[PDB]
Paper text:
Crocagins (1 and 2)24 are very small, intriguing RiPPs that possess a tetracyclic ring system, which consists of a pyrroloindoline fused to a tetrahydropyrimidinone moiety. Here we use in vitro experiments to demonstrate that three proteins, CgnB, CgnC and CgnE, are sufficient for the production of the hallmark tetracyclic crocagin core from the precursor peptide CgnA. We further show that the hydrolase CgnD liberates the crocagin core scaffold, which is subsequently N-methylated by CgnL. The crystal structures of the homologues CgnB and CgnE reveal them to be the founding members of a peptide-binding protein family and allow us to rationalize their distinct functions.
We hoped that the crystal structure of CgnD might yield additional insights and determined the structure to 2.35 Å resolution. Intriguingly, it appeared as if the dimer provides two antiparallel channels for substrate binding that terminated at the respective active sites. The catalytic triad comprised Asp325, His328 and Ser79, and the distance observed between the Asp325 atom Oδ2 and His328 atom Hδ2 was within the expected range (1.8 Å). The distance between His328 atom Nε2 and Ser79 atom Hγ could not be determined because a sulfate ion was bound at the active site, which led to a rotation of the Ser side chain. Removal of the sulfate in silico and subsequent rotation of the Ser side chain did not allow the distance to decrease below 2.8 Å. The resulting lack of nucleophilicity appeared a probable cause for the slow turnover and was supported by our inability to label CgnD with phenylmethylsulfonyl fluoride. When CgnD was added to the product of CgnA–CgnB–CgnC–CgnE reactions containing 3a and 3b, we observed the slow production of 4a ([M]+ calculated, 495.2238; observed, 495.2239; mass error (Δ) = 0.2 ppm), which represents the crocagin core scaffold (des-methyl and des-carbamoyl) and also corresponds to the mass produced by the cgnE knockout. Slow proteolytic processing of modified precursor peptides has been observed in a number of RiPP biosynthetic pathways and may be linked to biosynthetic timing. The intermediates 3a and 3b are then cleaved by CgnD to release the core scaffold and make the N terminus available for methylation by CgnL.
Residue numbers in the entry:
A (entry chain A): 7 to 167, 201 to 265, 275 to 347
B (entry chain B): 1 to 161, 201 to 265, 275 to 347
The structure:
């Protein structure tokens, strides 16, 4: 099969496993061990710095400079061939400061914020939190049958089981705007935490294959050939609206904003193998993304 | 068959019928909140499930509505803040505090909430509230009660009403210090919010009938006659440990703390009808509590 042929590492992200967690609803199974992916006792992915030095369990020594990359599966590094090939590892291997992997597979913006609030007190002082996010809230909105504007939603809302707070959606395209509220509210909270914990904050719209203008590599073409939202609902008009909408939110709140889809389109990636699927990145993808992050002042 | 009479609950506390019917809905992340737009003589909730507050001159406040110049404070907690046991919205603590002035008080009581749910409810709605002068937390007991009802627990997250994050409890009494972590962690987030939103913060251990020294009223004697968790797990030894443990957390974080159980034991309430049940207050109880809160400097 193509996925096993070209991206064999994916069989291991299938086995990594999720567990139910109160409030968060889910996180990664802790203590997972494999050559591709390793998680510590709280479910956080290992980070690899220089010469194979591994960091986990919120370990922090004196004088260490620490930063946090927060997001979904792009931050976790689904599609990487190893812990060392993920963004936090690549960022740690370059810059002065080490980076924490606060990526949560399939997390919405609200789960990203909550994961940080649940553990912030164990991390020490952070210089910079970079948020690499956005796409999941758009995706899971269109995968939802019901939605609460004030709270948002998350993927496995099979968890839920006359007046209600979570209301049925009648027209996803006509009610789009409602999903922005959760992002704007979550960003406002990050802004509050930025000043209180004295870290710089940057919001980065994560890359989506259909939104990056790039002649695909032979590998990509074959991988994508194997659902109507990620298709029809996520067209370039959608990108136009979403990107603009998040840039407006961030500007109003004086949050540096960086749209990685536009950044990757401006680079010359024609024919380069960047994606293992429409959402996830290869090792080379992470290398390029990291380069663009550093370059864009988001690190 | 001999004629049937009203249950002691319906005869002495008929308003409890309305609290049974008021309703509870599922909400993501919070897991549950009050059914919105509920109408009854006893209890009313707005479009978000928050209870109505009655200010001076019988004026009702809801929907986070605010006028220019208003001084606003927030009472955050569980069913004691919500006002289960009251005969009307106007007999609840936020209403009693708003009538006294100088500020109007929001009812951020969530029925059955844990400390974590209380914090999340606030983080989900804070941006809509405007400036707050003081948040008063009236809480604690539920985290203890829910810990002893839980069969499983994740120390980093808590709980509410192949490896795992949520671990089974082997001995509640021996693992009971685990529940302090969630309280201390949430309080540190409150402490952080108090600085960023510039409001005063104060913690009040909510009353529990078994923890208040008071010769029972005749109503209370009938009502209490009818879960050992209340019988043996919440004994005076438990009260001693819990109260002292919360005092230590609050002193470390420089948060003013008030043990309402001790405050009420010191007053002359012998024979007075304070408790609708072991956890819920009468109207009279809310007046006593309000006076104690104001005199204690917790408002």
């Amino acid at each position: 099969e193509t996925r096993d042929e070209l991206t064999p590492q994916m069989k291991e992200y299938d086995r990594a496993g999720r567990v139910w967690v109160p409030y968060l609803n889910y996180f990664h199974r802790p203590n997972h061990r494999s050559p591709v992916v390793n998680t510590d006792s709280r479910g956080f992915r290992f980070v690899v710095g220089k010469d194979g030095r591994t960091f986990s369990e919120f370990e922090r020594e004196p004088g260490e400079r620490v930063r946090a990359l927060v997001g979904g599966s792009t931050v976790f590094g689904v599609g990487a061939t190893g812990d060392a090939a993920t963004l936090p590892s690549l960022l740690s291997q370059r810059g002065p400061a080490r980076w924490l992997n606060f990526g949560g597979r399939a997390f919405s913006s609200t789960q990203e914020l909550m994961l940080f609030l649940f553990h912030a007190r164990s991390l020490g002082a952070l210089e910079k939190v970079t948020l690499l996010s956005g796409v999941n809230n758009l995706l899971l909105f269109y995968l939802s049958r019901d939605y609460a504007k004030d709270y948002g939603s998350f993927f496995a809302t099979e968890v839920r089981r006359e007046p209600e707070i979570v209301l049925p959606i009648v027209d996803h395209d006509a009610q789009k705007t409602d999903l922005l509220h959760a992002i704007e509210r979550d960003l406002s909270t990050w802004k509050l935490l930025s000043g209180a914990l004295q870290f710089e904050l940057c919001y980065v719209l994560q890359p989506l294959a259909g939104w990056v203008r790039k002649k695909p590599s032979p590998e990509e073409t074959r991988l994508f050939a194997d659902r109507q939202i990620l298709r029809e609902k996520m067209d370039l008009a959608q990108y136009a609206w979403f990107s603009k909408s998040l840039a407006d939110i961030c500007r109003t709140q004086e949050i540096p904003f960086l749209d990685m889809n536009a950044t990757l389109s401006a680079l010359d990636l024609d024919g380069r193998w960047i994606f293992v699927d429409r959402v996830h990145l290869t090792d080379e993808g992470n290398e390029v993304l990291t380069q663009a992050l550093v370059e864009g002042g988001a690190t």
